[PDB]
Amino acid sequence: MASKEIKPIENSIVKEIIVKEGESVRKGDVLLKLTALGAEADTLKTQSSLLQTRLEQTRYQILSRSIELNKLPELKLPYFQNVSEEEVLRLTSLIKEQFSTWQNQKYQKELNLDKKRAERLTILARINRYENLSRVEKSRLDDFRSLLHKQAIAKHAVLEQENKYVEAANELRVYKSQLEQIESEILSAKEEYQLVTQLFKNEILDKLRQTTDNIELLTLELEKNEERQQASVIRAPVSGKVQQLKVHTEGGVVTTAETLMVIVPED
Amino acid sequence: MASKEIKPIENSIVKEIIVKEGESVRKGDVLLKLTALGAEADTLKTQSSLLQTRLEQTRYQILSRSIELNKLPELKLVSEEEVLRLTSLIKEQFSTWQNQKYQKELNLDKKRAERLTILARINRYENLSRVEKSRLDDFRSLLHKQAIAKHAVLEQENKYVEAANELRVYKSQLEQIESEILSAKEEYQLVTQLFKNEILDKLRQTTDNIELLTLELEKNEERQQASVIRAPVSGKVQQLKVHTEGGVVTTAETLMVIVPE
């Protein structure tokens, strides 16, 4: 009577061989335990990916807090027990570069803003000065005109004084328009200053969202990987004696093409 | 017996001759009426003085009003070349005053401009000092966490203290310029203060002098009244100077003679 060949339905790793050579088994008995080839590998890869993603999450949470503090919090990891510390110092160092870059951007936006405010101060000074000047020369002009109602001064001086007044007035006009322009520019500068931290915070909580989502996905994936690395049993399809048992393939690879053992019917 | 000469006791003007040639007169009778020459002279001169004092009085009165108006009134009240001298002098005084006010005011305005500059610098370095202070804090906390050069941190210190000291200096400057501005203000006030004081000092004096010259004019007018020469003895009037009415006679000259009868 024909011997029945026992072959894996997929490429596998022999975990445990239960039967022995020559042993009689009945249909349904356990012969050996197998795991899918690559399952363990996949699990480890998902674990490592998960670890990295958690690290980067931690980085962006610490940055997120650094924005609200406007200072760096304690740079420590909060699972992480055997994380290489040079990984930790690389991470903290990235945190430091990002934070310092942010504060520098804020600082130079602030410098620009302050220079604009200085411009405004100068312009305002000029405006007030020419307000006073226009006033005194206007009153002096009126005086001179009354002096030419009563023939007490030359017309020449009167019209030169007019010229003075009109001069001062025009100057005043010019500086006022300038003030309008500079005021507008100052509001713009303010908006840029806000824009720095606006963008930075956006980036930070977008990468926080991304790290959390990816962690969840990798968690589902990790569940799948962990379940798939679980051992399956090959049972005896018929009753009989176990022969040609590959007794030393435990921990070794067997493909779907290869015969693990054969079962020879006894009756 | 000798004939008696009739001569004035001072230089005089014969106003009216009462007696006639050959007329018999008694001791005490009126011969003529005369006025002192210097009496009339004095009267004319006090009149002219009074006129002048009134002119300058009006001048300082209208100037006095011109101060409160800050403008020339009228200018109307006598020789018109006097009127033009007076009006033009008024104009020089007033214009001089307004010019003085004008340049005290220019000075004051330059002081105010300086103050503006100082305030601008003060505010700019207030902002700057704040910004560099915040950067300093940032750096110090950055090396609480070992993220920056110590070099950079204390160089930042240097920046901040620089700005702060600058601010100090500029503040002291502001105080000085403020004091100077108050000084300038007081000078500006002082111009019109002095001008008004002198003007109603000359008003006081011109009014007082007007009153004095008025009393004096009364005295002179009374003194300008005609006196009578009476006959010192009785007799006949001879050698009567019929042609001295309205004319001046000296102490040396004989008005007439009286021959005893």
Automatic annotation (TrEMBL), chain A:
The keyword Metal-binding does not apply. Keywords: Cell inner membrane, Cell membrane, Coiled coil, Membrane, Transmembrane, Transmembrane helix, Transport. Residues 39-230 form the CyaD-like alpha-helical hairpin domain. The keyword Protein biosynthesis does not apply. It is found in: Cell inner membrane. GO terms for cellular component: plasma membrane. One of its GO terms (biological process) is protein secretion. It is a single-pass membrane protein. It comes from the Bacteria. Residues 158-228 form a coiled coil. Its main location: membrane. Belongs to the membrane fusion protein (MFP) (TC 8.A.1) family. This is Membrane fusion protein (MFP) family protein. The lineage of its organism: Bacteria, Pseudomonadati, Pseudomonadota, Gammaproteobacteria, Enterobacterales.
